[PDB]
Design a protein around this ligand. Structure first.
Ligand code: C0A
Ligand code: CL
Ligand code: CL
Ligand code: CL
Length: 293
């Protein structure tokens, strides 16, 4: 049981040691396309790149590159697309990816500004009457409605392919209180948000992979996806979180950026497992503890 495992790690004080092991054992794959001179202005950070083997390709002749990776968890039967916070020049590319990959959900775990510095472009409309048009990729994006809670907001967006005039509803799940290299306020706060995403339908296997991003698309995004995947495994199945993280790190570098994020992943999975094992009351308990109202 990982509860027994957790307390022993806490007792030995070995979180930093385990985390450093994970970094050492993590896959090292080439990112040659990301590092092409022509793609320099498409990367938010020089030290964060998608692997060639798992990168998302835009369906365009000129340049198919976007800083985004397909994480395909075979046993858990879920795929995620992890990407950086879009740049002012890659917002069109971002929504092109969403369209082409047929995603119906976007999970945002950062703020556009944190500690007085920009971490992400304003890639979605904040007001109904100010829709966005992405001329380079011929897409239109409209805010239809929003549901604002204390620490997260769920937005209903309409994405239109202007070429075909087909439209799709995209749900935008914005976690607003998760700082860079930090952790969520509580396991309850995180899990209340995660299951909101789960219950929305956005993660349906009939849809394309959910798009998850923060600023770099590795720390907070990695934490989110690790916890979700482990919970999936606990239901389908003795879950080895280090092993699952190393598996995910085959698809994108640097997933989970601090030892404390690793520790939090344990806490979240342990607490979330209560719901998995059949205790109804725990979900409304999270909601109360999250103080979303
Ligand atoms: C150490 N590298 C950096 O700080 C940045 C890249 C980076 C990596 C990870 C994050 C994050 F963990 F917070 P995430 O949750 O994934 O957004 C951030 Br923010 C930034 N590179 S640097 C040294 O060029 O500025
Ligand atoms: Cl080039
Ligand atoms: Cl924001
Ligand atoms: Cl790392």
């Amino acid at each position: 049981e990982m509860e027994k495992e957790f307390e022993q790690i806490d007792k030995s004080g070995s979180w930093a040691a385990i985390y450093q092991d994970i970094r050492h054992e993590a896959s090292d794959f080439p990112c040659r396309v990301a590092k092409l001179p022509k793609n320099k202005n498409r990367n938010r950070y020089r030290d964060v790149s998608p692997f060639d083997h798992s990168r998302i390709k835009l369906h365009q002749e000129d340049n198919d590159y976007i800083n985004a990776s397909l994480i395909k968890m075979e046993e858990a039967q879920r795929s995620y697309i992890l990407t950086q916070g879009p740049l002012p020049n890659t917002c069109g590319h971002f929504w092109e990816m969403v369209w082409e990959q047929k995603s119906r959900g976007v999970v945002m775990l950062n703020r556009v500004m944190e500690k007085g510095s920009l971490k992400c472009a304003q890639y979605w409309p904040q007001k109904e009457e100010k829709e966005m048009i992405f001329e380079d990729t011929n897409l239109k994006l409209t805010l239809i409605s929003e549901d604002i809670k204390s620490y997260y907001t769920v937005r209903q967006l309409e994405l239109e392919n202007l070429t075909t005039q087909e439209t799709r509803e995209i749900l935008h799940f914005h976690y607003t209180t998760w700082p860079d290299f930090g952790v969520p306020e509580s396991p309850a706060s995180f899990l209340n948000f995660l299951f909101k995403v789960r219950e929305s339908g956005s993660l349906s296997p009939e849809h394309g992979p959910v798009v998850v991003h923060c600023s770099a698309g590795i720390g907070r995004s990695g934490t989110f996806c690790l916890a979700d995947t482990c919970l999936l495994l606990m239901d389908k199945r003795s879950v080895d979180i280090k092993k699952v993280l190393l598996e995910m790190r085959k698809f994108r570098m640097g997933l989970i950026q601090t030892a404390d994020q690793l520790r939090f992943s344990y806490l979240a999975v342990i607490e979330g497992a209560k719901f998995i094992m059949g205790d109804s009351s725990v979900q409304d308990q999270w909601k109360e503890l999250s103080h979303e109202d």
